[model samples]
Target: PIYVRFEVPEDLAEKAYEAVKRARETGRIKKGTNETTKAVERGLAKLVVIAEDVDPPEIVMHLPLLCDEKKIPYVYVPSKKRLGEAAGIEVAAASVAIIEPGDAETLVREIVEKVKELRAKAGV
Candidate 1:
């Protein structure tokens, strides 16, 4: 099993999927995908991570319900450009959702715990 922690906007779904990608460079991120059509159809997503720099397409419009249905955690990063740098990606992607395992429990737990605290404070 793998686990994850992500930063997000307290009041809204403001988030970025770049952390996972950049993490992958140093073995932090595990994988990446942009196609939500197939992503939602399969139960392959761990967290519905999005980029804070997401522009055009407004891909954000379609993911919430899918994550809710799949019961997957979703979030946004503050910048897509930064995320691109992290993932070694070139263009600023609107989103970079990925799948992860539960093996990173300790790390994930810390993240989940903080998210809980943040969400609580944010009024989630």
Candidate 2:
């Protein structure tokens, strides 16, 4: 859980998934660790959703740091399967980056604000 900066409550986590799903349908998303990394590094990612169940932890350990470095917002969901489903993918995904918010623009902004509040409260 080193990659997890703070705990995201179930309700917020649900919104994170919803944001991903909406982005996938109406905007754009990058799936998997590598793609997510690329999107974050290049500053194209608007929001990043990472799966908490990813094996080894290290697979996505750098994501939070990368997101922080790029000043992008990120949240973690408890299941990879659900995260993949949200991303509109058949297989499980380690992480997903929303490159374009489209219809989820407001939703993404909300999530980002919430995440910032949570991080501030957590003192991470």
Candidate 3:
């Protein structure tokens, strides 16, 4: 069901993960759901990544809704630990948002297109 909801293609997912990693390396990132929400709501988030394994998944459930409302591109990865690793952190992360694209701009653009395609495919 969640797959049907926001199933990003593997290639796109890889690009997104790398984008976040690059963003963390040279740009800015908002780690965790709270900071990610602020970035999205404040119009600072370029792309958002949410984890599929978050407990009480409802906590991150609203992220997609919020992203949709703000016309932000968002995707889900299989693990929060990986998400944190990409963000250059050690703790698990439920969500993260790229505030500055840095060298990841190209990847972000591609992911944006994928996000649109997935949303259309999902009828979102």
Candidate 4:
């Protein structure tokens, strides 16, 4: 419905954002649509974050489909600018893919567990 869903709790979303931020600092991340696409296609992306404010929906609409095909996890954030700031980039990005979890692995797992729990609760 809402782009295959945020129905995600705010704290969980923030956990995801923080994971990306920490990954950027000590591990690896892929920025922008193209890079994110590449990471997903290559099976390198552990998690993907995309901003809902991205101007051209077409550019990123295919991301969820691809992520599904690759069995990768993805989430949506409200602000592209804040996404960029967390990513250590000056320009707002349409997407960010985590290539290495590093210190963020536990947080990522917790988020995934929460998502799974939510999905079960929703009966979907």
Candidate 5:
């Protein structure tokens, strides 16, 4: 995908999904492409989770750029279905933005730090 700067390991990706789930339960999250974009643009998103399997890819491609500009932490998970599940939605989610970490604050911090290291390694 054009939005992917570097590969996210499967394990870390799982943690990313888990963070979203916890955030949804205890805090707030914006589901789908439009809402996610708005959250990132408004600098309200603490963490962004994008699905790698989004068809046409353009649906969520701008997210990475927006996250970079907003300096928000973002990760790519393998499936939109799983992402939606984490967001507690019935349909697949192209992207999700966690507005608050709530109970998952520590996990969010850990993921962001790891993402920083990964981005540094990827020379992004």
Candidate 6:
């Protein structure tokens, strides 16, 4: 299931690259983010989902907690491979986060809806 559209709008891509590029340029990306463990505690990491066919559950088990703490919406789709392809990526594993809420409104809302739909299906 493709929860998020994954369609990278040109403007949106430019915006994202700008943000990341600026972060890198100003060194804010590293300075702003705490260490990885601190990030986990603060929930800086957002969407958390393990691929249906992935092995070794322990590696990804903490993802849910990190995401929940940050109040970042997340979901598990039927395929990790598909997620990668949609992002034009080749990996089967992904941990995505959207730090800029203003820029994420559209895509986030779409994914948010999908998350709710999944909850309903789960009888939540």
Computed on alpha carbons, the lDDT of every model, listed in order, comes to 0.50, 0.92, 0.84, 0.84, 0.91, 0.42
**Stretches of candidate 2 above 4 Å error?**
none
Q: Estimate, for each residue in 1-124, the C-alpha lDDT of model 5 and write its tens digit.
A: 7777789989899999999999999999999899999999899999999999999899988889889988988998999999999999987899999998999898899899999989999988
Best by lDDT: 2
All candidates in order of lDDT, best leading: 2, 5, 3, 4, 1, 6
lDDT of 5 at 64: 93
Winner on TM-score (1 vs 3): 3
User: Please, what are the lDDT tens digits per residue for candidate 2 over residues 1-124?
Assistant: 7777789999999999999999999999999999999999999999999999899788899999889899988899999999999899898889999999889898899999999899999998
**Candidate 1 runs further than 4 Å off:** 1-19, 26-37, 101-108, 121-123
Which residues of candidate 4, in runs, are more than 4 Å off? 1-6, 121-124
TM agreement with the true structure for every prediction: 0.61, 0.96, 0.92, 0.89, 0.96, 0.48
lDDT score, candidate 3, position 33 = 80
Candidate 1: global Cα-lDDT? 0.50
User: Which candidate do you rate higher for lDDT, 2 or 3?
Assistant: 2
Look at candidate 3 and tell me the lDDT of residue 100: 93
lDDT of 1 by residue, 60-89 (tens): 656655666776656666665655565566
lDDT (tens digit, per residue) of candidate 4 on 19-92: 88988988899999999999999999999988888876778889988997998988777778878988999978
Candidate 6 structure lDDT? 0.42
Worst 10 residues of 4 by lDDT: 1-10
Ten contiguous residues with the weakest lDDT in model 1: 1-10
* Winner by lDDT between candidate 5 and candidate 2: 2
| Error in Å for residue 82 of model 1 | 1.1
Question: Is candidate 2 or 6 superior in lDDT?
Answer: 2
lDDT of 4 at 113: 77
